[PDB]
Amino acid sequence: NLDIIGKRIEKIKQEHETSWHYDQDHPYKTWAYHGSYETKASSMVNGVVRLLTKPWDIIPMVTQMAMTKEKVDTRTQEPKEGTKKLMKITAEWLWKELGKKKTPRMCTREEFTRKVRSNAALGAIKWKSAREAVEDSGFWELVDKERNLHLEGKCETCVYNMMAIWYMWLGARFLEFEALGFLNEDHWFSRENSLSGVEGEGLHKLGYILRDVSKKEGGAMYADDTAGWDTRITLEDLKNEEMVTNHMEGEHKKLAEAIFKLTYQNKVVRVQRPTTVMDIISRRDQRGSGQVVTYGLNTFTNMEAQLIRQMEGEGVFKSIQHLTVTEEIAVKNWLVRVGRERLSRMAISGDDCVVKPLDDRFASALTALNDMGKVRKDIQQWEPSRGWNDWTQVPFCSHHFHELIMKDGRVLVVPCRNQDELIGRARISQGAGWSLRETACLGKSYAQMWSLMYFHRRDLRLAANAICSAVPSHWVPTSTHEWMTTEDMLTVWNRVWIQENPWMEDKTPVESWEEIPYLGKREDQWCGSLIGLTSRATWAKNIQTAINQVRSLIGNEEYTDYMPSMKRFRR
Numbered sequence: 001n002l003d004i005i006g007k008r009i010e011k012i013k014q015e016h017e018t019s020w021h022y023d024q025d026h027p028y029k030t031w032a033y034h035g036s037y038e039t040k041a042s043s044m045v046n047g048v049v050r051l052l053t054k055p056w057d058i059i060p061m062v063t064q065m066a067m068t069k070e071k072v073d074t075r076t077q078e079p080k081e082g083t084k085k086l087m088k089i090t091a092e093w094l095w096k097e098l099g100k101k102k103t104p105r106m107c108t109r110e111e112f113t114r115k116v117r118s119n120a121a122l123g124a125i126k127w128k129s130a131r132e133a134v135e136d137s138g139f140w141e142l143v144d145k146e147r148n149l150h151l152e153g154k155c156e157t158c159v160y161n162m163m164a165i166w167y168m169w170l171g172a173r174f175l176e177f178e179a180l181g182f183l184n185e186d187h188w189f190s191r192e193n194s195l196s197g198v199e200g201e202g203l204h205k206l207g208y209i210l211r212d213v214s215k216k217e218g219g220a221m222y223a224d225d226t227a228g229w230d231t232r233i234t235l236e237d238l239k240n241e242e243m244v245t246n247h248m249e250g251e252h253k254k255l256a257e258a259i260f261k262l263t264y265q266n267k268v269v270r271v272q273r274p275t276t277v278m279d280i281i282s283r284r285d286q287r288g289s290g291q292v293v294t295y296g297l298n299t300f301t302n303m304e305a306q307l308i309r310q311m312e313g314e315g316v317f318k319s320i321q322h323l324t325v326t327e328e329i330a331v332k333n334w335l336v337r338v339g340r341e342r343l344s345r346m347a348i349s350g351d352d353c354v355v356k357p358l359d360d361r362f363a364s365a366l367t368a369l370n371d372m373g374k375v376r377k378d379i380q381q382w383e384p385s386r387g388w389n390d391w392t393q394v395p396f397c398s399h400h401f402h403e404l405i406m407k408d409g410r411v412l413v414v415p416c417r418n419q420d421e422l423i424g425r426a427r428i429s430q431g432a433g434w435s436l437r438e439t440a441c442l443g444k445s446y447a448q449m450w451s452l453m454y455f456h457r458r459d460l461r462l463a464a465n466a467i468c469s470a471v472p473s474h475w476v477p478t479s480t481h482e483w484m485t486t487e488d489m490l491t492v493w494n495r496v497w498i499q500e501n502p503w504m505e506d507k508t509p510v511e512s513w514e515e516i517p518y519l520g521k522r523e524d525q526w527c528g529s530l531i532g533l534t535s536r537a538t539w540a541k542n543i544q545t546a547i548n549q550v551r552s553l554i555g556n557e558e559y560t561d562y563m564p565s566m567k568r569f570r571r
């Protein structure tokens with residue numbers, strides 16, 4: 001407790017000896033409050049994308065996206081003994097399986113520096129930017145001090161800042177990356193290694209993966225969301241995740257144990273409270289880690305929970321209250337006998353899952369799932385899950401997936417979501433100080449993503465071609481990301497959908513964009529197309545005038561006309 005968090009608490013109080021007010025009106029119940037001290041990033045519109053998507057200026061679902069808790073202060077109960085036993089047995093077996101073909105290892109200062117020098121979200125807070133602290137040895141001396149302290153089993157500076165997303169100073173992030181970065185850097189949650197995972201799988205992969213799950217004999221496909229997954233991570237979950245250290249050795253094992261003990265299973269956080277003080281609060285459970293370590297540990301614990309729910313549906317155990325000695329044997333024998341087969345019936349991306357169980361008993365197998373605290377979103381606690389009968393209607397990673405047959409008979413499985421969401425996101429830039437050139441290169445990144453993933457949506461292929469025509473041809477797209485390149489998008493399309501696509505036997509390249517199909521016109525409208533509206537017809541017909549408006553603003557640069565890549569503009 002205070003023996004582990006005290007030092008961190010003391011150091012902050014000292015730097016705020018003046019203003020250390022123990023407010024007696026603190027709003028925290030489930031967080032432990034310690035003290036306070038005196039202190040003092042909205043959406044911005046991308047003008048390049050907006051000028052080239054004029055019909056959407058009058059669609060509230062698009063325009064409202066650019067305008068403008070009671071979950072974090074909740075307390076999850078302690079799982080029953082039978083549940084705790086199911087979780088420990090499953091977790092032990094799952095780390096063994098994930099470790100069979102992987103070797104845990106420390107990630108290096110050298111690896112961390114490259115990442116920072118390639119700009120990535122390390123959710124970090126003397127040095128202005130991380131790119132600077134990484135080139136100054138003084139920061140690394142600070143890392144050494146905390147590191148040696150971690151080897152002592154104590155912590156000084158690994159403190160969270162709330163905003164939910166939990167930022168730390170770069171030094172704490174390095175220590176987390178050095179101990180646990182291997183999970184992501186060496187692809188422990190790849191589909192090949194984990195069977196349920198999809199780490200490294202682009203949107204041109206996910207629909208084919210759902211279709212492969214659909215081919216298994218079984219019941220409906222279930223895709224139940226958890227209500228605030230991060231807030232429902234129990235201290236028992238944090239202890240099963242820590243068992244990854246059992247696969248480690250020497251220094252690494254010690255360093256990993258310290259991240260789990262001192263930063264995850266005990267947390268210190270600073271929150272901005274307008275009534276404007278900074279509150280120093282602590283607690284033991286819930287998810288607060290780097291977003292990338294959070295992804296892999298979410299995937300792990302979700303894989304564990306869904307195998308246990310599958311066990312409950314198959315009747316492997318009778319009640320969560322208490323597991324008999326023989327029921328433990330049975331659970332272990334199920335895992336050994338069919339565990340890998342049951343993992344292959346799932347697609348799991350952090351807190352997001354799709355499960356095709358052995359049959360529909362799974363729908364009403366709710367006791368372990370509720371008792372683990374993984375309570376389903378938008379459904380009564382004991383109401384049976386509603387499954388999907390068609391893999392093309394299953395939601396996963398904010399998408400659904402269409403089966404699309406090319407004029408030459410080959411099959412594309414394409415990602416899709418409501419088009420208002422796609423256009424609304426492309427119209428938003430994050431942060432400030434953007435030049436016109438940098439705003440244009442972000443618009444081009446969205447346009448090239450649309451050409452690669454959403455080519456089958458009439459409005460996005462036309463808008464992508466218009467943006468790529470309006471932005472200098474050689475300007476590089478800014479902020480898998482196969483669209484982040486200056487290479488010709490037809491060549492990238494061929495590499496992604498044909499050459500490298502393991503579900504495509506015939507490798508005959510496509511010679512033009514007109515060989516590449518669209519959804520049916522009615523399906524396109526169902527998924528939010530404006531095709532058939534007067535606003536959209538005038539936009540399409542007059543598109544060269546919009547392209548010329550943006551070219552005039554950017555100035556006298558080298559531009560390519562991509563519009564004739566489409567039949568209607570091809571004379």
Ligand SMILES: C[C@@H]1[C@H](C(=O)N2CCCC2)CCCN1S(C)(=O)=O
Nearest residue numbers: 198199200201203292295349397480
């Ligand atoms: C690439 C991710 C995800 C992944 O590999 N991540 C590792 C840590 C951050 C997320 C895998 C599923 C697919 N998506 S998605 C739908 O493109 O966002």
Ligand SMILES: [Cl-]
Nearest residue numbers: 388389390393
């Ligand atoms: Cl359905």
Ligand SMILES: [Zn+2]
Nearest residue numbers: 400416417527
């Ligand atoms: Zn669709």
